[model samples]
Target: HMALSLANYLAADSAAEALRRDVRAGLTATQKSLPPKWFYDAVGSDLFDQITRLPEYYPTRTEAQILRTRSAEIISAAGADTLVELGSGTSEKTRMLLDAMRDAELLRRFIPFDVDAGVLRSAGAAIGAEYPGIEIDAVCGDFEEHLGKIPHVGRRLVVFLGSTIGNLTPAPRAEFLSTLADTLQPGDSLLLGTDLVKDTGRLVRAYDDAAGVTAAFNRNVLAVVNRELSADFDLDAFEHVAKWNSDEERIEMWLRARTAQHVRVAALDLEVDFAAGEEMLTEVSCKFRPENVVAELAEAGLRQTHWWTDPAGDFGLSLAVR
Candidate 1:
């Protein structure tokens, strides 16, 4: 009864909880590796949308293009009764996939989850208005913790699309993929959109774009703290630096303080200080080859059944089985 009530209206109640996990994780991540969930505050999500449009960022646009070309086959292969999209943002790119599903006469419900209500509501409502019959079960929850709550009664495809998998470290990434596989029963496939390992220069440029939107996205994490906690953060005090760590095989995005300063978070009553020119690591985007993705999936008790990519090889989509 309680679960059915959630199907009526688009809700983002879990948005707050998701954000809280991000903040706490971001606040402590430098000391220990933390997930990059903090990058999607209200404004942060907007900046990410802008980042997608930047000339250098090719993953988002490439994946969208691939969807345009292959959505029919992809949807047919998965045969989804419902689309459970993890980290579903403004649904800009997803419209292409949904259209294919609707054309195939398979899309019945959409469960798009994110950490922001405004974005979720806008996207969920747009889908509902456009599709008419398709119901929405939009949830604002963290994929790490809340993915289990998504109800799947029939053939469903759980899409972890977008290059979100690149954010996780080795062990955590395996754990997450395994847990996601556990969310579904046998024959229910997991569709993953992954950024494949490629040219070092191209990968670096994608994160450090020429138009500066990626920089803005990286710095926006600090702005998130300021708005959420009323902290005194001089945006100019921090410089966004994105460079690939060759040994780590990832692009590291960090906030380097220009001068020593103390930031106070009124909401948490916590003050964080930095030394002169000290750096606080913000995020990392790791690149993976087919071997990495396959091995990792295998470790997570998942079988990589199918793989697809564009002619350019900029992004990839794989279907895995539990």
Candidate 2:
């Protein structure tokens, strides 16, 4: 009773061009910063999957625990006929929600949106095989730019998990939430995963782990640049740095140059210079409190209906109505 397929809106060349544009802008900025989304090329994606399993990394497992225990309640509350997941990755934890919806007889279709076409196709095939009556409309595109393209099949639940929202700074975060708000209809709901503020040590350790996988993940961005932009970067010349910015209430990841160096990106025909010990910011992961999350959602024209957290209170999962 179900059909499975993939809809891809992003092309390899377009993705490369976008990467070149962002890299040129970031490297040339007064304070160099690469957008966090650039960290998910194939190798980076696999490295991140490893990060989630680390003992110090609490967000992924904590979110899974909450979803595992509370999905039935969540399904009952939303009664969504369609499930749309942003940055779906492999849809591993999503299976729990999908099962809950199917068992409740409310699941009619699934839209797993992401920039990776291969992941979308594989996840769609796996999920389709498990749920025969549901429609797997796996969409391959940037979630922020393609939300309008997702069909409004029925009362829907849109999920942005893994605290990916934390990747954006204040202004962009607000803008993203507003865009999401505008896209949703009166009955649509959003289930958002946010990492909560906790002990500074715990927060810092989560981003910089003992096994150094997080460090490798941080530098993986340069690998992406070297391959795509025809740049020559001695990955060894830079070291990973993770710091807790108390005033900003976020964990910041950067690559610090060991010595002065100049690099060239052949594709863009651009040359950038770096000073010894200079830092190029790579990503920011903001920690949030429940009230702040509520206020932010309200600012974006959504009302927080319910909030849930684990026993440790290290993470948050909130349901907001648009």
Candidate 3:
């Protein structure tokens, strides 16, 4: 028997409303920007997966190496009966963690938290097939608002992988980390995957891949805005650029307009003008210094217990206990 259930806390139209709100807020700003979350509507996701396989993009593979080699150790350190993965409901990469916990005989419940119920359902079903009768409780809700709503399960190992924390700026990231700290008991653990600050050339190349798959991924968000917000953005008129910002210790993806253009957004009754060579920031992926990682965890009331990285030190997996 498969034991999988979904707890949906979102309003019926929450997704639609969020998209509309984010699109309007992002597009109309002085320096136009869009959240990276919008870049995952089918085609964009495929493009991202393709980007992951490219030679220049080492973060995904580096993180994978750490997990494959050290996941059992993390599970052992966690000593947890429940595993809760935050942000994304699941990724195939997480099977190692599940297998490790199962082998350790501490795997009792698995919870995947996210906004999309479809992702939760499919992810749970896939996991449940191999681990029949394992408790698979999925939460369909927002991370910012719903981390506290996570059900009571004894001694949890909460994993927030893929360096998704990089997407958030410091202010919100602090709030998020603090909120997560408050959600845990003394014995719980957090496994955080982070991309490390590395060679500037390598960092830039990761985002601006030679094969241009990442560029396509960056531009796909425009198509989403066009389709959903009734916005008229010439997807071809913009060129992708990935730049390393030394001050922020992050890589930023921006779409630069090739020529001046005016676009209309019917849904919001708005028009936007683009100047030749003007840039609209798309996303920021913050690379972490290991010291900063430790300090940040400490600030959030989590004590660093373990830190593991790929042989090249391109990525890190930190296990912190509260």
Candidate 4:
């Protein structure tokens, strides 16, 4: 009963309705390419959880290894009473950090924020159950827009884990860091996990996983559009293409329409024809260098304080303070 009340309250109270309206408007303006965030519906979330486990996807495992090796040291240095996790999906990989904090007895509360109500409820319930004394205040909303709504009890450590920050374009990345710097007080810290630039061959293989899970995940976005908007997107007309761009130094995922086709969205009463080889850019994963990130942070009134990466040089996590 309590959980049901919590879920309904969150769903009714969240700004998602307005956000969804705005998102749909924005996507329509962009010719119906939905934001990658929507790629995290229940099934999409499950697929992403699988994406991380694929052997070629080293970012998840490498980042986890770093957390396992360094969480204690990080908790000791931060000693925050409250841990604020943005996009706390499943919170499965984050158990390593929470466990280390528990052993060190440095944490008093946890604020798990997510855009998905289901994710928030499930994660919040599990964490609250596992920790006897820790307080769980789960807020369901977009973290990039609503991080301010999270309650701050004491010294707070804001965690932006999972290299999800790489999803942002350069300009937004700088603005995001600036916002984080603005949000935190003088002593507050941000724990950021990021992917690092590496060999093109490996990067491409990571996105274009051999098991075809990535391909299916990419196609699922279109499936979602078709299901929701009555879009006549010919799923067979498009093929998933994952390639490493040496010039951009990132992995680019695109859905290329194999042949020109007129698609209609019944909900919007819109129709458009794609070219023979039209490409709808989907997601870009920009790996970063430590020095470059420090520079970006400097632009945001933040400086590099600490950095950690796995032995394989796949993913990195850094602690930056105001």
Candidate 5:
């Protein structure tokens, strides 16, 4: 029997409403900014897929390598019955752990959680077909808003890949880690992927590549605003900027205005001004240290049980238990 169930915790129009709210509030702020999640539209995602293969982009491949080499140890260590993925877009990296768990005969249920129900449905169907017996419990909701509501499957292993935790700054990251900890049972495990701090030039080059895909990826946010909000933004007038914030131990992606201009949004009846050379923050990607990772997890009520890195130590993957 094909077993796939979906639980949607989002309002019908939550995506559109949230986009409008974030755009309005972010653009009008003293420090104009847009969240990095906005860069995942159809075209934007494809551009990012291209980015993962670039010579400078190390996070994606490094994490995948670590996952490949350490998946068996990870599965055996956790002995999880249910596999829960928090931001499981396409669940590509998850197949490594899933394969290991299935081989170990421990996988009972697979939960693929994400914001897009369409992707979740398709990805869930594929996973359900691949593993005949395991139940596929796909969830459609934003993690920040509805994480606690995930079905309490027994002895779950929640995987958050792509170093997405870095997407959050310190304060919100702490709150999120705490919330995640609160959701898991004492026996459940967490597999977290994080990018490690490296050479400043290398990190900056990773974000601002020579092929200009990252630049296009950075500008995709403006494209989203223009298309969805009916805003007039001269994409050519903005320059992509990536720099390391040593104080914060993160790479900051920004869009700098080349010329002063006032852009109008017809849908919201809004006007936004950009000063020449002024920058708008787009994304902050935090690099983690091994000690900091353990400390952060321990502070959130989870104990870091194991840690692995690629041969070059370009990425970090840690296993934590509640």
Candidate 6:
């Protein structure tokens, strides 16, 4: 009853217009900042893949182990025939879930959403080739903006893995979860991946890795702005910074200017000035406690039905439902 299909959620003009508005607003703010979503262009995506493999990065591998070990129980609990994933990326760990679903006789279709067209296309082709009978429907757009595009398939499993939810600040995160809860039907459920609070030293090193790959990943945001918006950002003049905010319970990444500099964004017809040591916020990864997860889901009109974590307890994966 299913066949491979791809949906283009991003229209050219609309995407460009949205980017322009966001970039102009973000950069011109008193505290300059960039949206975390901008960090996954082609090069950024490749860099993130490297970050996941680095020794200091534990969330990716730890979550993978949890999934590999518990996918069967997870699939049975969700009772999902259709799997819809947000920010599926390479979907490297998703195969485990897909296989588990197939074994349980619940597998029918896979829907992976992302902003990268190339990633979606490549992932779709490879997944379809590997699972011949499984339909692959890849959505090319920002998942936060295009939830309406997801089909109303019965017994759906919606996944937002990789702790990507942490990237949203507190307010936006709440809004996003509420919107998702409204979108799901009674039988549908959500599997959310969250990075949990850990030793400050370990958490800091995870973002500021020994090999400096994380640094490059942080600086690549400038490269993205340069190429896409005709901005001349002196990448060398900015250094990557990662800090643990104990009170906030999050790791924040910033690009700090080494010295005063003026940069021009030609496409936007805007010029910006930065003072020495000033910082532009790049990303934040919020670490959560188990109780916080319960409260978060409850606030959005969903209840946590199950929670799973690796033996080390460095990351969390939970199932929630309406």
TM-score of each: 0.87, 0.96, 0.96, 0.90, 0.96, 0.96
Ranking of all predicted structures according to lDDT, beginning with the best and ending with the worst: 5, 2, 6, 3, 4, 1
Please give the lDDT score at residue 228 for candidate 1.
64
Stretches off by above 4 angstroms in model 1 are 1-35, 266-271
Better of 2 and 4 by lDDT: 2
The superposed Cα distance between candidate 4 and the true structure at residue 105, in angstroms, equals 1.6
Error of 4 at 150 (Å): 1.7
How good is model 6 by TM-score? 0.96
Candidate 3: lDDT over CA atoms? Answer: 0.87
For model 6, the superposed segments whose C-alpha errors exceed 4 Å read 1-3
Task: Supply every candidate's count of residue pairs whose N, Cα or C atoms clash at under 3 angstroms.
Answer: 0, 0, 0, 0, 0, 0
Per-residue accuracy of model 2 over 1-322 as CA lDDT, tens digit each: 2356777899988887889889989998978888878999889999999999999998999999999999998888888989999976365679899889988989998898988887887777777788876778888888768878787778899999999999889998999999888889888899999999999998989988999999999998999999988999889999899999989999999999999989998998999999999999999999998889999999999999888899999889999897
lDDT digits (tens) for residues 1-322 of candidate 4: 1232222234543444543463456445545355676576667878998998999998887887888888888887777777888876365556777787788877777777777677677777777777776777777766667656766567888889877888888888887888778888876788988899988788899999999899888878877777766777777888889878777777788888898878776666666667788777678888888788788778888767888888767788888888
Each prediction's RMSD over C-alphas, in Å, is: 3.7, 1.5, 1.5, 2.9, 1.5, 1.9
Clashes of 6: 0
Candidate 3 lDDT tens digits, 148-176: 88987888989888888898888898889
Cα distance off (Å), candidate 4, residue 63 = 0.2
Tell me the lDDT of candidate 5.
0.89
lDDT of the candidates, in the order given: 0.75, 0.89, 0.87, 0.76, 0.89, 0.88
Model 2, runs deviating above 4 Å: none
Candidate 3, poorest ten consecutive residues by summed lDDT: 87-96
Q: Is candidate 4 or candidate 6 better by TM-score?
A: 6
Per-residue CA lDDT of model 1 for 23-116, tens digit only, reads 6665655452224566776677788878887888888888888778888888888887777788754556677778888888887887777655
Task: List residue ranges in candidate 5 displaced over 4 A.
Answer: 89-91
Considering lDDT, which of the candidate structures 3 and 4 is the better prediction for this target?
A: 3
| Candidate 3 wrongly placed segments (more than 4 Å) | 87-90
